Design a protein around this ligand. Structure first.
Ligand SMILES: Nc1ncnc2c1ncn2[C@@H]1O[C@H](CO)[C@@H](O)[C@H]1O
Ligand SMILES: Nc1ncnc2c1ncn2[C@@H]1O[C@H](CO)[C@@H](O)[C@H]1O
Ligand SMILES: Nc1ncnc2c1ncn2[C@@H]1O[C@H](CO)[C@@H](O)[C@H]1O
Ligand SMILES: Nc1ncnc2c1ncn2[C@@H]1O[C@H](CO)[C@@H](O)[C@H]1O
Ligand SMILES: [Mg+2]
Ligand SMILES: [Mg+2]
Lengths: 467, 467
């Protein structure tokens, strides 16, 4: 059972909008909206959405495996060894939010301070003492973005596993000699940095020049979760405010995916006439280029929706019925919808590009979708006894049993552990969700289960000397 | 009674090192070390110190008033109006950590997200609705460091008040016409930005080219807190580890101030021979240029301690008895003392340059000295009933009484409120202390009251879905 299996099972249920049914439903952790900072829903005037891994959640492991396969094929076509074709995606290895160290070729799981929680070189998990050879303070400088790459989104799961596969392959293939910073084959030297860049380029290529989008659209049921409650939620949002789409995807792909997401024999609820996806939005903006979008952005363009090409010139006109924008900036949305940032709830999955940057640059309210949370919640409750024990062991310490229980707990989630922690230590990703996501949930659809006057409440924070 | 009055009263007490006396003493909030993240003191191998407002706490309001007076005199000498000479420092106005908005000439108290808590234009405190004219989302972009200047240290208290005095003066003097971004007098336009830069330049000038240091050193008792427990604490640290000084001050001024701080008729404890200040340090480094120090730093130089001038050339030799360094980087300290960052506890007052940057760039352990905390603690306990009420009002809301109690509470601290909050809203400074200071206290001397095997403990943090 994957996180997307849980999501599709919930997606298959029709909405029961009886107020007592709703209250009961949202008490289950799977259907709850979690609160880091209080948010009065009554004050939200505009609801904005990302598309990929927000509205359109790709099924796992099918979509990751397709990405993986095509990326490997691209690498082989540019000259990587044929042995790559023997690799197969393994959903049990990668956890999201890992850091690839391009100098030494390690995948790192770190905390908010750059402290190392896990270090894997290929499939070799390095113990603490051995990590000090390369990381003398068991620490990385997060500001060193030329060296370290944070794998933030679900799109990065294939490459997370592929990087490990490659390091493992070159390390153990006798044609190559391993060095601290890469591999030698005769008179050719491949640094881990150059390897990483090829992988990144190949992932970008499959999405933009290769066949990934074509294969996705040709079997949408295989690759994309569909939920009849979506138009219901959006129609309800439009009753109390404005609704917008601001997505990095282009118009043609956005149209294909959105059409599928609304492909039911009804509109908002069973019995109602079907409505085009575009009708649910007061403003539609593609090619957003987030997070640049939340700074200077790019020139505002108009899409010719018949051809899917951009019209020539910068668009200088007003918001009109049926218009679709491309590029621009977050100021485009504020101006055209008559909104200030705190009037906007933006809903997306990219902790950096959707949530951190909209919060820090513009003071938008934020809702982070974390698709894996459904599965993480199952594990968290199902294995609560290991964490409970760890809590008691930590307290009684006021040590090797702590390491053993930490490992056993972490292994329940996968080889790279929970998205949110290693034992008692919170990950960078956890810390960023807390600090920048006002609300978060396994799915944006969980908003459906709360009234629009709801006050999401978080406890006031006190400093140690105030407590 | 000022915060420095509280500190000097404690400084005047001799140490009672009876273990039961110590335990009793450190339970009083004034003498406690507060803990944001757990820290096992046994693992600390090196204790490092800043000088100004860490070891050498300047008396208030005398030192601020001297700085203020000299800065005003410098501004008048470059051509500012003679009316400036009628200003007098007022300790009741400034709180540390405010943001000067160079565009519109406002002092802002903000939270971690850039949300406005207080806005004063001169001495005119602007209400919420009126603030929206200039701050439409009641928000500033903290990343805009060319526009916004954060007044982080106690050295910035004079200029905090001076900026307000100037805006007030020019606004109300009929020789000038007020504009959104500055003041006109005939064919001369003075932007708030240019005004700010003159003030900053004048403060730097008084400290580096003017008479402030001379006046300070000529009456050390008037201007600097002295505490006979200092050599006791340092001697104890040297028993279990290494001790270093890394200060932005130059050798001559460092020597004057340090000599005063150790000027007692005894060494570590009454009855013992007096020892030169330098003897308490395994490494002494001046002209540190923090926070650049924690990145590339500057060339390592050697001080000629007889003349106080730097020797010509980069110093390429070893750590030797009696050597004093200038410049270099944090790597100088790690290499020469045989330390990794997590082995080092660095103690300083600069939230950005001492604490945030050492933590983020190098993974050092951190101790933030907050001299005002003594007074803030008095107010926090003495007026606990107003905060208690605010807590209850916030809960019962699940509004104008909330604003009234918030104001009354804040006014107990000064016109700009508490360093740490406005009502229920934490300030940026509070948030940064929590996130980057592992430990914090009113004085570094509070470490004396804990054994060196002490485990400072903070509760494990949980996300909302884990709770
Ligand atoms: N999750 C993230 N992904 C990518 N870059 C990030 C992330 N979090 C912070 N940063 C950037 O990395 C640097 C801080 O380590 C800054 O440039 C910051 O903008
Ligand atoms: N997926 C994994 N497989 C094997 N060992 C792991 C894994 N993740 C962490 N560890 C190990 O557990 C120890 C820390 O709990 C470390 O030695 C680390 O190598
Ligand atoms: N307290 C502070 N004082 C000055 N600059 C800061 C402070 N906190 C963060 N910054 C800097 O301001 C920018 C983030 O708002 C970054 O360049 C960061 O390094
Ligand atoms: N020092 C002050 N003097 C007068 N009013 C203040 C002060 N600080 C905040 N306020 C006011 O209290 C209100 C918010 O509680 C705002 O109108 C703000 O102007
Ligand atoms: Mg997305
Ligand atoms: Mg200092």
């Amino acid at each position: 059972t994957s996180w997307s299996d849980r999501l599709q099972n919930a997606a298959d249920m029709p909405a029961n909008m009886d107020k007592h049914a709703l209250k009961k439903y949202r008490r289950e952790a799977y259907h709850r909206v979690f609160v880091n900072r209080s948010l009065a829903m009554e004050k939200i005037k505009c609801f904005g959405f990302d598309m990929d891994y927000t509205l359109a959640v790709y099924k796992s492991p099918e979509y990751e495996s397709l990405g993986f396969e095509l990326t490997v094929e691209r690498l082989v076509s540019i000259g990587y060894p044929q042995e790559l074709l023997s690799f197969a995606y393994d959903s049990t290895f990668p956890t999201r939010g890992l850091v690839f160290d391009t100098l030494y070729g390690n995948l790192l799981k770190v905390d908010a301070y750059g402290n190392l929680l896990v270090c894997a070189h290929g499939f070799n998990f390095i113990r603490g003492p051995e990590t000090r050879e390369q990381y003398p303070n068991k620490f990385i400088q997060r500001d060193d973005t030329e060296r370290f790459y944070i794998l933030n989104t679900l799109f990065n799961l294939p490459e997370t596993y592929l990087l490990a596969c490659l390091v493992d392959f070159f390390t153990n293939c006798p044609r190559y000699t391993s060095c601290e910073t890469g591999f030698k084959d005769g008179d050719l030297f491949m640094s881990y940095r150059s390897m990483f860049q090829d992988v990144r380029d190949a992932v970008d290529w499959v999405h933009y020049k290769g066949s990934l989008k074509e294969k996705t659209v040709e079997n949408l049921e295989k690759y994309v979760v569909k939920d009849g409650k979506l138009p219901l939620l959006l129609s309800r949002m439009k009753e109390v405010g404005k609704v917008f789409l601001a997505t990095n995807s282009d118009y043609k792909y956005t149209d294909k995916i959105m059409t599928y997401l609304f492909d039911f024999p009804h509109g908002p609820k069973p019995g109602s006439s079907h409505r085009p996806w575009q009708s649910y939005f007061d403003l539609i903006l593609v090619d957003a280029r987030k997070p640049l979008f939340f700074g200077e952005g790019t020139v505002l363009r108009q899409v010719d929706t018949k051809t899917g090409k951009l019209k020539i010139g910068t668009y200088t006109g007003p918001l009109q019925h049926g218009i679709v924008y491309s590029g621009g900036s977050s100021d485009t949305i504020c101006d055209l919808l008559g909104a200030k940032g705190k009037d906007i709830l933006y809903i997306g999955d990219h902790i950096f590009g959707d949530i951190l940057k909209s919060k820090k640059r513009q003071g938008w309210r934020t809702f982070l979708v974390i698709p894996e949370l459904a599965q993480e919640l199952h594990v968290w409750t199902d294995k609560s006894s290991l964490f409970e024990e760890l809590q008691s062991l930590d307290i009684f310490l006021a040590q090797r049993r702590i390491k053993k229980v930490t490992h056993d707990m972490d292994m329940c989630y996968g080889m790279m552990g929970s998205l949110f922690r290693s034992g008692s230590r919170q990950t960078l990703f956890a810390s960023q969700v807390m600090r920048y996501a006002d609300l978060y949930a396994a799915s944006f659809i969980n908003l459906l289960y709360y009234p629009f006057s709801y006050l999401f409440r978080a406890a006031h924070v006190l400093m140690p000397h105030e407590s």
